[PDB]
Symmetry: D2
Subunit: 106 residues, 4 copies
Amino acid sequence: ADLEDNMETLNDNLKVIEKADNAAQVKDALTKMAAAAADAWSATPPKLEDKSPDSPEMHDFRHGFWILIGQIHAALHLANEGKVKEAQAAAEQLKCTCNACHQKYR
Amino acid sequence: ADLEDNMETLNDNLKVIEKADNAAQVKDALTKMAAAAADAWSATPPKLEDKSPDSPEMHDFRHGFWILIGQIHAALHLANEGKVKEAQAAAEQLKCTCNACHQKYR
Amino acid sequence: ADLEDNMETLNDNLKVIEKADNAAQVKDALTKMAAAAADAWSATPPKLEDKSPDSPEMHDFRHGFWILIGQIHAALHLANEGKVKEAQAAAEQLKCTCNACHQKYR
Amino acid sequence: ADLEDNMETLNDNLKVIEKADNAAQVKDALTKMAAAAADAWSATPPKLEDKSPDSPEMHDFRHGFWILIGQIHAALHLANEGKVKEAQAAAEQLKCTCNACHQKYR
Ligand code: HEC
Ligand code: HEC
Ligand code: HEC
Ligand code: HEC
Ligand SMILES: [Cu+2]
Ligand SMILES: [Cu+2]
């Protein structure tokens, strides 16, 4: 999609997890978010349309995305091991990368 | 997806990346493999239908999707950093994980 | 340290962790847990002294060592933000990875 | 310990990883760089002695060791499967997270 769209894609599935009924709901959000990640991972955001894509600062906006996905599929290692409340909670305790990025980069 | 088509996409991108020129195809191909081995996460294997789905075998079967998916995203990290070939590199070392499964759960 | 030793260390620091009181008292045994898991990662127990170091069945064994200290730090990663009972919770899913391996190769 | 000397632990061990020819040298070096990361993780650098441990400057700063030990361990993977060319070829690559959190927070 586009950097801004992707970001609402993840605003969606992150409350649909918090809402999560079952273990497929979670499983499906987490999918459509690492899906939704990668797409962001390759964008240049507003601010840093001045830093090279080689810049230390782009590595890191790009590494914010790294981190995120690791946090996601580690939520998926808890959705697929039968326990959703702990997966749900990895998905809340996830906003720490979210705000991390924004503050640096939005 | 069904397992063996997930596995086919997996294999097919493992060839793309192997035969890739630049940052995109690697990124695009590893982005595909992601969703792919994401999906197989839950998909169930024949040889483990006679183990509970909340068993240490089934845990340790899904756990190999955890991994896999990460070497993929770690490679994506170098793909998404311009380090084209060494994403191709990372692509090949992946294959410890893929195998390690096959020799346990195929 | 050889095998059994890295283990009980990993298995003592677990108890230390469950009961402990502060994020810095649960830190240092999640670091202990790790450091030992690093030294366990070179190991080759009896059930796999059987097979080769290039064996995939060797590679899968030294992969729960990858997983584990992966999630050890996902657990270390919560202590550091004042999240104690969450990172003591991570300490408890994290043993489905002690699980995985024992059910295969001990 | 205080973070200061942690950040010269890490550096030299890079000196001592690209000053290897074989496993343990590249396999142990990386070992203690993980301890190196582990303790630093908790410390408040000079430049955030004004912000709260709940703050997204800190969340992010100490997320940067999260990564690191991933990139380290991940290069210890290949160190343990025997792959020195591939774990050294990969330790110097971690580079772009050394110099990523420097430029931001150092
Ligand atoms: C590295 C990313 C991988 C590649 C390349 C392939 N796989 Fe797998 N895989 C696994 C099992 C138990 C099967 C059996 C299929 C079934 O029973 O229906 C498969 C299947 C395949 C196939 C072909 C299957 C066919 O009949 O056509 C290919 C070509 C293939 N896989 C390639 C196990 C696993 C697994 C468990 C965690 C890992 C991660 C991978 N395989 C990874 C790869
Ligand atoms: C937390 C993640 C873990 C705990 C807690 C324990 N293990 Fe391990 N383990 C593994 C093997 C292959 C052995 C063989 C023992 C031998 O060498 O004879 C063990 C052993 C233990 C022991 C008993 C030690 C003794 O004989 O005196 C305990 C209490 C124990 N383990 C607890 C394999 C693995 C492994 C593979 C990657 C995982 C990650 C762990 N074990 C993890 C834990
Ligand atoms: C690794 C970096 C990264 C993290 C992670 C990230 N964002 Fe963003 N986010 C950005 C950037 C850059 C912008 C501003 C992009 C722009 O203005 O074009 C942004 C902006 C947004 C926007 C503005 C949308 C718009 O269309 O104007 C929303 C909504 C948002 N983030 C939600 C989220 C949520 C929810 C999460 C976690 C589920 C998240 N973001 C995680 C980098 C990130
Ligand atoms: C998570 C953030 C982060 C990581 C990752 C990081 N640094 Fe540091 N670095 C810092 C901070 C903060 C300081 C300031 C040290 C102080 O005086 O407390 C620093 C300082 C240093 C120094 C100067 C030591 C001094 O006494 O001033 C060196 C050398 C250094 N880092 C090397 C490295 C290397 C090599 C790596 C990667 C293996 C690395 N750093 C990774 C944050 C980081
Ligand atoms: Cu965090
Ligand atoms: Cu990087």
